[PDB]
Amino acid sequence: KTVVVTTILESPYVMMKKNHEMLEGNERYEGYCVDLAAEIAKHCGFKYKLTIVGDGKYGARDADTKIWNGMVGELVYGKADIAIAPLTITLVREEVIDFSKPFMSLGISIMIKKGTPIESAEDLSKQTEIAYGTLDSGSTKEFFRRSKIAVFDKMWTYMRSAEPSVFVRTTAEGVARVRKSKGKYAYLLESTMNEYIEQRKPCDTMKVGGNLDSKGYGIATPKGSSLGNAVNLAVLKLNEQGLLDKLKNKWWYDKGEC
Amino acid sequence: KTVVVTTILESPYVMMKKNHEMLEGNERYEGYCVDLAAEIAKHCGFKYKLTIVGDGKYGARDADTKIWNGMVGELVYGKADIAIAPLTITLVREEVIDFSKPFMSLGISIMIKKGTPIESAEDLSKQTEIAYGTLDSGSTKEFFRRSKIAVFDKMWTYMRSAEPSVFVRTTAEGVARVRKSKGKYAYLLESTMNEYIEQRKPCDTMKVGGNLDSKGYGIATPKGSSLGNAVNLAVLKLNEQGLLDKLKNKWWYDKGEC
Numbered sequence: 001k002t003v004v005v006t007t008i009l010e011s012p013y014v015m016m017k018k019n020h021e022m023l024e025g026n027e028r029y030e031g032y033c034v035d036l037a038a039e040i041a042k043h044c045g046f047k048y049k050l051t052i053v054g055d056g057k058y059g060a061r062d063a064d065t066k067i068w069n070g071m072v073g074e075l076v077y078g079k080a081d082i083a084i085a086p087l088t089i090t091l092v093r094e095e096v097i098d099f100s101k102p103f104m105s106l107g108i109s110i111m112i113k114k115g116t117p118i119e120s121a122e123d124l125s126k127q128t129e130i131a132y133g134t135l136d137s138g139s140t141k142e143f144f145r146r147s148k149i150a151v152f153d154k155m156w157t158y159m160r161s162a163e164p165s166v167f168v169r170t171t172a173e174g175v176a177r178v179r180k181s182k183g184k185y186a187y188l189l190e191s192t193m194n195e196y197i198e199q200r201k202p203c204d205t206m207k208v209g210g211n212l213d214s215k216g217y218g219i220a221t222p223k224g225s226s227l228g229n230a231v232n233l234a235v236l237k238l239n240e241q242g243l244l245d246k247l248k249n250k251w252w253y254d255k256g257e258c
Numbered sequence: 259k260t261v262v263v264t265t266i267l268e269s270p271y272v273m274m275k276k277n278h279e280m281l282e283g284n285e286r287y288e289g290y291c292v293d294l295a296a297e298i299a300k301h302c303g304f305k306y307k308l309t310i311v312g313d314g315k316y317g318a319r320d321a322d323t324k325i326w327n328g329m330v331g332e333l334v335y336g337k338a339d340i341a342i343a344p345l346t347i348t349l350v351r352e353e354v355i356d357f358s359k360p361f362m363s364l365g366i367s368i369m370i371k372k373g374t375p376i377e378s379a380e381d382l383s384k385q386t387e388i389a390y391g392t393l394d395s396g397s398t399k400e401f402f403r404r405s406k407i408a409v410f411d412k413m414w415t416y417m418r419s420a421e422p423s424v425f426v427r428t429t430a431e432g433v434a435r436v437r438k439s440k441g442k443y444a445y446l447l448e449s450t451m452n453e454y455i456e457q458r459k460p461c462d463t464m465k466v467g468g469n470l471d472s473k474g475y476g477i478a479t480p481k482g483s484s485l486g487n488a489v490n491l492a493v494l495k496l497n498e499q500g501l502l503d504k505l506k507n508k509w510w511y512d513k514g515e516c
């Protein structure tokens with residue numbers, strides 16, 4: 001049967017083509033994950049249909065209702081057969097879905113408006129003039145919520161109680177907030193996204209400091225899936241053949257605007 | 259049953275303590291992987307015995323007999339229950355053993371004496387005055403053997419027919435060759451090791467350029483092991499607690515002598 005792929009609209013991973021209204025099916029999209037999906041499918045030998053996750057979330061369990069949302073939920077409840085997106089491999093998720101070895105390595109990072117007097121997480125934690133937040137509902141937020149490290153716990157204490165909310169619905173919302181903040185808002189996001197935005201006009205943001213942690217994105221499938229084994233071997237083969245590195249250059253720097 | 263852990267003497271992962279002569283069992287060793295093994299055993303609630311791999315190799319398949327050697331071989335043939343070492347997750351190995359998600363991300367890098375006129379892999383492939391090689395029976399050597407990248411394939415043609423052999427039996431021998439070669443030998447090795455050595459006296463070597471690829475080390479178990487699942491979740495939990503980052507600082511820079 002045709003494999004149902006769930007993904008999310010997050011540049012430069014998945015994006016609508018300028019003339020998508022004129023195209024059909026998979027041809028409507030373009031991006032790092034669109035290219036990767038095509039390759040994984042060829043190497044595993046299956047036909048697929050790309051679908052954008054209904055609720056636009058990555059995946060979190062609701063304490064109380066115990067229901068999983070986002071791409072993770074689509075896999076858990078059988079709405080999708082595989083997820084190809086910048087989905088962070090985490091312990092809680094690994095407990096309900098399967099992940100291939102990572103196709104990209106990254107870490108949480110700090111995005112500032114150029115000129116902002118901030119160079120580290122410690123800098124953010126020791127002051128209050130500059131507000132900071134993260135994407136809401138993702139692994140970055142959870143990182144801070146669960147951290148037992150002094151600096152990060154101190155950061156979470158501030159963020160969870162800040163008003164108005166310092167959290168954002170989407171990356172684009174986070175970046176727009178930094179750009180219009182006049183330097184009074186710093187955004188905490190995954191390094192890969194930070195590096196991408198730094199190469200986009202108006203070229204007014206920059207990544208500062210080292211990453212706060214280290215982790216990776218993996219291709220996910222429902223537990224016990226027939227595709228799990230093959231997809232994992234495909235990711236390793238594609239990394240060993242240099243495809244992954246080629247794709248990142250293609251979508252990050254080959255198209256740089258700064 | 260006590261779990262038999264196979265490992266390899268490679269600084270700073272597994273090293274005999276200075277006073278090992280008066281110690282017994284696991285107490286004879288210290289290092290990143292020794293601490294990791296203890297961490298894992300504590301969370302999965304099991305007793306273990308650290309054993310140094312007999313042939314001192316990581317693991318490769320004999321092209322003629324199809325027999326696996328090194329730590330991979332010990333797992334494949336059932337001589338060990340788990341391997342905790344700087345063992346690279348690769349496609350060929352993934353087909354015969356199981357790997358947990360990576361506990362450390364790294365890449366192949368260049369080691370030069372210091373003052374050596376080399377800044378990249380391209381620089382090496384352009385001249386013949388400076389020799390260069392890699393370790394044996396490892397993922398690094400296989401990388402060049404299989405690489406289709408113009409530069410990396412050109413480097414391999416040289417390394418393959420190089421006389422005398424530019425390959426070494428151990429990292430120690432490679433670093434030693436760099437130091438005594440008056441800058442006429444450059445060594446290609448895994449970034450983690452390169453960075454560790456750069457912080458070791460005589461402080462006469464240095465890592466130059468960016469990594470040539472991206473990969474990760476993982477804890478391995480034989481296929482169909484009752485330990486695989488639990489250990490994988492253990493690695494994720496440990497990375498999320500910050501222990502893995504705690505451990506690298508401890509053995510890489512906390513003890514740095516430069």
Ligand SMILES: [Zn+2]
Nearest residue numbers: 039042043243
């Ligand atoms: Zn292909």
Ligand SMILES: [Zn+2]
Nearest residue numbers: 297300301501
């Ligand atoms: Zn612990």
Ligand SMILES: [Zn+2]
Nearest residue numbers: 320321322323
């Ligand atoms: Zn042979």
